[PDB]
Amino acid sequence: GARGGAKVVIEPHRHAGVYIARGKEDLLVTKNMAPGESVYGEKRISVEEPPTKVEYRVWNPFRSKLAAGIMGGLDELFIAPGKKVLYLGAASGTSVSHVSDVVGPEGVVYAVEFSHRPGRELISMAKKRPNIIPIIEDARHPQKYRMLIGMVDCVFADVAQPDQARIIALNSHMFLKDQGGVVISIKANCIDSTVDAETVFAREVQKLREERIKPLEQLTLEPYERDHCIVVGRYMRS
């Protein structure tokens, strides 16, 4: 498929900060803030532009659920160039570097993690990206790291816990803008394995309504993942 010597045909995506590489295969692709290296062993395109050598990084939908959402065809994404982003559940730069690639140098990505053991790689990745800031802290207690976060246009939640709706809520009230963005990744197995996949998603859409998020759309991540969807909302404090 995408073998080293072949050439590809890179064009913008519908969403700003996202690109498509055409050819015999179509790849969801975005540029590199730190050209010449890969963060998780991902593959990279090189383009010669006037001549300066600009580089791009491939998105793997299977590894990144956000990339799976793009392949699923998310209608609107608040993550965009020049927008502050607060990404929860920052295991590593597998997706944070990709979310970074969208916002650009002007924006920053506020990466939140709990466990120390991934944080070391997240800190190391943050060095290569001067806009990525790692806040290794329990997202269940936003007040611990209110010290660290300036305000955010969109909150993305990668956190896989049963009480994720509460984590998303407390962060959203403190830090999200009125009419601000919220994107959440849901794994029904983590929340409630006893009941079917679907009903969990119905329940999850409910909480966002009581703590004042007007949710906008959900997208199941088949064939890239099972028992998953990406629910996107707008935070209407009013």
Next chain:
Amino acid sequence: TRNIPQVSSALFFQYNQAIKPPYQVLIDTNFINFSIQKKVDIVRGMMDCLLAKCNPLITDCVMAELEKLGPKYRIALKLARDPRIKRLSCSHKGTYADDCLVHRVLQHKCYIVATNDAGLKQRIRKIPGIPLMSVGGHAYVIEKLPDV
């Protein structure tokens, strides 16, 4: 940007493989009224009809609509407020409960509908993988539920 909604992953052709016991039912205003006419109390009527634990659920529109009915239908309003009946919040302007319900069942394939209104039964029938509950004869009846 053109949008083509996905078909739910819980639907095998026209068979919904997600709705399993315990069930969730949305109650329409007419259903409470016709339930009272037949002396069929709400929760057992699903228990004996469906042979499964059932979680009744009412929307703000339905709660709003029962209230505007007036003094003639007090017991219908009260019965919607029984503790075993949970409530479903709504974030849309209109109080038209029929349009609210069709969106939810379109939106999400984990609910049964409880209604007897004519305009509603035809519309929901077109939606695939949606069981329909109605009150007729002496007890409730379930049409589009394979597990029965």
Next chain:
Amino acid sequence: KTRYYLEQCIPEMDDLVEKGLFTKNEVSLIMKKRTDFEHRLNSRGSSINDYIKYINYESNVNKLRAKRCKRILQVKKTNSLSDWSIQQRIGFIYQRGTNKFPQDLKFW
């Protein structure tokens, strides 16, 4: 609220004319400079220099009233609002500039 500040200046203007220290045309000229400054102070782009330019202005007016008090009235202090009106204003100018610009340690 530009007119509100100008109106507080009317009573002392009347006192100046009543005592004979300043004629109506002379009093009119003083108000014109006060009016122009007040618009500068209450507008956008107002800087601490505008307070300093105003604060010096009534200070000069204070000196002239004192000299004209001895030159016409031949009195060290005439018991009327004019004596303490300017000094009360000067403090009333300062506190806005300090509140508006707490940064300038020079103005403090």
Next chain:
Amino acid sequence: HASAFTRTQDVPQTELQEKVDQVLQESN
């Protein structure tokens, strides 16, 4: 209102306050 001129703590909060206070008590 709280004022720097008059102490409102009623006790020595810093380590300097106690040290100067001991001399004041010891002196007279």
Next chain:
Amino acid sequence: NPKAFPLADAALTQQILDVVQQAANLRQLKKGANEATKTLNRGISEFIIMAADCEPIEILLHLPLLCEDKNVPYVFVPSRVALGRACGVSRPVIAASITTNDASAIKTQIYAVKDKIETLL
């Protein structure tokens, strides 16, 4: 605090070792730190069981990186020799992996232990 964390208690260790033998009979068990590593790379594992008494314990902390990066639950057991006896293999075993198969005969009891592992973490 310890690098060996969380460590299953006496009871939870028993049901886990029940998984490993029954998985071993069903050819759903890849045992050892090295072949535990690939199963994470391919994303074909429910969970990886390791021994907390390994000498040094250091030789298995590459695995939790992959698991938590891949959102794979994991557990440590006090004894490697006990774990190896459960693998059906004549030697001590320091790590083991149960592989993803919804077509397995032992789906339920694995997902039973899955839920307790997730609670432990």
Next chain:
Amino acid sequence: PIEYLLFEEPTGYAVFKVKLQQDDIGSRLKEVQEQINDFGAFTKLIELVSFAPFKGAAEALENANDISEGLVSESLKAILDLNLPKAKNITLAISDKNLGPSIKEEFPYVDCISNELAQDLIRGVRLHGEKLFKGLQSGDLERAQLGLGHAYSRAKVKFSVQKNDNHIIQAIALLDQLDKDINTFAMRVKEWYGWHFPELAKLVPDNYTFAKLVLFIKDKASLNDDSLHDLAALLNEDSGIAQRVIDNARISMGQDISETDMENVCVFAQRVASLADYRRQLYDYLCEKMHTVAPNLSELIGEVIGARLISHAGSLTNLSKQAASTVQILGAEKALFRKNKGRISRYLANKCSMASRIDNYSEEPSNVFGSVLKKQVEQRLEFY
């Protein structure tokens, strides 16, 4: 009933005074909510009264840890007491309920608030940021947050520059770059001086030796017995080049180059000498730093080999996470670990994949396990 508000910034601590109390009855109505977003309305609610910048970076982290644990720092105790009246009880708004008891213990006369009304004001103080400071020197919050983020984050992990391993990758990349430039410049020295005395380029094939000998032998005409001893001291006379260079220098075809031409070769040769000396120095630095960072890998195989393996993975963490088979092919393009020969390579590769782990995931790795790991490789060697 709120009068004072405590806000806390990366640049400092900021206390506010609440002139007007927002309608607590109608908190959830939209119009009061829009006032929070609107700067003009919000300035009528509160106004800044205290700002106490932190002295510097070190003190900020100490407070950042204290505030995270709901503790009152000495700097925090300073700003409150100067501001809150002693007073029935002055009411203060704080974002944290956990910080409330700490403030109450220090100041019995203050009652803390963390209800949604307080949260509404705290959100709006944060919404406008430096706008509410009326120009008071608050630096830039967005930058200051990012610095405290590495500072606050890294502290809990106990990461160290000791754990830092990329210095090897920079050293190796620099070392090989030095070798190419030392060689590349050195061939030129033979060409530039080859015109003047071509035979000498053949006599001393060692480029580093040749540059030194050109430095003393600038002009081949200058030939003395004492100079012969001086160049004889360079290297050894066993090769006999000392007599050959004199004899060749007496009688040679090389065309004389100008004084400016001769000024360049010695200076440019001097440049080659410095790089070789620095490459020796950087090589020793690379040797020492691995023993600190990767004693097990360095002892098992060697320093230079171990570093090249780490660079291939991209980091010591990358090397550790790979499986044994991948590590073997990670050095199969330059023969780092190299039918029976292959068996030792895979066996050593498995051990190398091991000692990489002991270095990466140990805060202070030792060489005790590397040594016993290498003897196991040694024992395997004689069996095969």
Next chain:
Amino acid sequence: ARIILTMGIRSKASETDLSEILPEEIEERVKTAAEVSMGTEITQTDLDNIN
């Protein structure tokens, strides 16, 4: 490079003078950047070879 030679560590930046290397407006930027910088401290062994 000349900055690295004049000052070795950011603590030196606050007091070290960069006038001969940089103009007045530029030299104060590095001083402000130094105290607010994002990087980590380095050892003297690291400092020696970088110099």
Next chain:
Amino acid sequence: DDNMRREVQRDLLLIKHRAALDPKRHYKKQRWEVPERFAIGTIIEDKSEFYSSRMNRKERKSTILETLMGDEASNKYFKRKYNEIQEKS
């Protein structure tokens, strides 16, 4: 660039006609138009993927097009159908 090279134009044509390149491969129906802003790129593999996703330097070429010729299987597939299309024509 205006007056673009023939090589870049031909590569664009290949993607617009990529459906017919291979028999066993099919695509989603798409009306592809040349993008207004655009760059050409090369696809760099990792070191660990030396065996899996890397052809030899000799097979690496300047254009997408001329690699398609080096694939003998593509040429025979193209040869046989043209003959069938001419015969029916």
Next chain:
RNA sequence: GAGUCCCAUAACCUUUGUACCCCAGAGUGAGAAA
């Protein structure tokens, strides 16, 4: 009259010399020895 602005200060191919490699490669996963 007429492109510096797609490195002729260069890319690619061929030949030659130097040093390694022909074990599988997301390598496989329980035998080996008697």
Next chain:
RNA sequence: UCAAAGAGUGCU
């Protein structure tokens, strides 16, 4: 350019 009409941004 003036000349008349829209739609956002900053700020009191």
